[PDB]
């Protein structure tokens, strides 16, 4: 039968443009980015290069993963996850890879704390990269589509690639799951959790217009329960008034080099 997430996606696509604009941020958590954006336009100051640092911070501060050692960041974009990881005491090296080029984000070079242990490489298609051993595996790849089947096909592609890296047995991981809400995806995620561990978490900084969840090494949740709970939350926010955004301070990543 049709899943709750599938019902959500269909209703999402039916919304008027004005309905959608309000729904997408209704009741979500958001970091204030005005200060960081203006500074990145005008390398110090501790500003995060994207709102991605705050998403990974949310997971790390709650114990959903504990980065350490050599960190590989697949789909690093501007570098928000890589620069956040470099501030963590147990992390020793961060290697980010991203496609870049026209139409896509290129790595930004900033001097937040630990910048000297970060290497971001653009021009790389991770689907044509040989997997390498690492201690912490991060991946934030998954482009939204109005078609749930396209989201499924894209997520299956990401997860097939990520499995090659997980075979090296990193002790910590955080993998974006763009589409967790179809029957095929739930079965796939259950099998992956049985093989590699971890569990799925919804980060409240995600907009209501995406069903993305993060498969993280420090969770133990049931696939069906965690996905359905997220679908119910997203469906419930489609009814009634616009709920206020919960704003928090953006992450300050400090400055300076690290001794290694």
Ligand X SMILES: C[S@@+](CC[C@H](N)C(=O)[O-])C[C@H]1O[C@@H](n2cnc3c(N)ncnc32)[C@H](O)[C@@H]1O
Interface residue with ligand X, options 47, 95, 99, 154 (CB under 6 A)? 99
Choose the one of ligand X, ligand M7G, none that binds residue 210, judging by a C-beta under 5 to 8 angstroms depending on kind: ligand M7G
Interface residue with ligand M7G, options 6, 20, 40, 161 (CB under 6 A)? 20
Q: For residue 242, say whether it is annotated as part of any ligand binding site.
A: no
CA distances in angstroms from 96 to 35, 62, 149, 162, listed in the order given: 25, 23, 29, 15
Interaction of residue 15 with ligand X, rule CB under 6 A = no
What angle (nearest 5°) sits at the alpha carbon of residue 137, between those of residues 211 and 164?
90
The DSSP line for 111-132 is --TTGGGEEEE-S--GGGSPP-
Interaction of residue 141 with ligand X, rule CB under 6 A = yes
Q: For residue 181, say whether it is annotated as part of any ligand binding site.
A: no
Characterize 185-216 residue by residue with b for buried, 16 or more Cβ atoms within 10 angstroms of its Cβ, and e for exposed: bbebbeebbeebbbbbbbbebbebbbbbbbbb
Helix (H, G, I), strand (E, B) or coil at 144: coil
Interaction of residue 144 with ligand M7G, rule CB under 6 A = yes
Interaction of residue 41 with ligand M7G, rule CB under 6 A = no
**With CB under 6 A as the contact rule, which of the stretches 124-132, 182-190, 197-205, 228-236 interacts with ligand X?**
124-132
Residue 42 burial class via C-beta count within 10 angstroms: exposed 0-12, middle 13-18, buried 19 and up: exposed
Interface residue with ligand X, options 75, 148, 170, 198 (CB under 6 A)? 75
- Cite the annotated binding site by residue number: 9-15, 50, 80-81, 98-99, 104-105, 125-126, 140-141, 143-149, 207-209, 214
Chain contacts with ligand M7G (rule: CB under 6 A): 12-13, 15, 17, 20, 144-146, 207, 209-210
């Amino acid at each position: 039968g049709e899943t709750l997430g599938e019902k959500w996606k269909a209703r999402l696509n039916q919304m008027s443009a004005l309905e959608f604009y309000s729904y997408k941020k209704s009741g979500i958590t958001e970091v204030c980015r005005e200060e960081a954006r203006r500074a990145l336009k005008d390398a110090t100051g501790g500003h995060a290069v994207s709102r991605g640092s705050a998403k990974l911070r949310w997971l790390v501060e709650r114990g959903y993963l504990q980065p350490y050692g050599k960190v590989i960041d697949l789909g690093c974009g501007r570098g928000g996850w890589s620069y956040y990881a470099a501030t963590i005491r147990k992390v020793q090296e961060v290697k980010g890879y991203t496609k870049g080029g026209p139409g896509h984000e290129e790595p930004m070079l900033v001097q937040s704390y630990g910048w000297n242990i970060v290497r971001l490489k653009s021009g790389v298609d991770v689907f044509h990269m040989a997997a390498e051993p690492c201690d912490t595996l991060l991946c934030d790849i998954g482009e939204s589509s109005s078609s749930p089947e396209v989201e499924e096909a894209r997520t299956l592609r990401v997860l097939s690639m990520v499995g090659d890296w997980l075979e090296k047995r990193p002790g910590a991981f955080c993998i974006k799951v763009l589409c967790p809400y179809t029957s095929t995806m739930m079965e796939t995620l259950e099998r992956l959790q049985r093989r590699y561990g971890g569990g799925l978490v919804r980060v409240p900084l995600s907009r209501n217009s995406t069903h993305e969840m993060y498969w993280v090494s420090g969770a133990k949740s049931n696939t069906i329960k965690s996905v359905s709970t997220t679908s119910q939350l997203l469906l419930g926010r489609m009814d009634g008034p616009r709920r206020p955004v919960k704003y928090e301070e953006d992450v300050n990543l400090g400055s300076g080099t690290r001794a290694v």
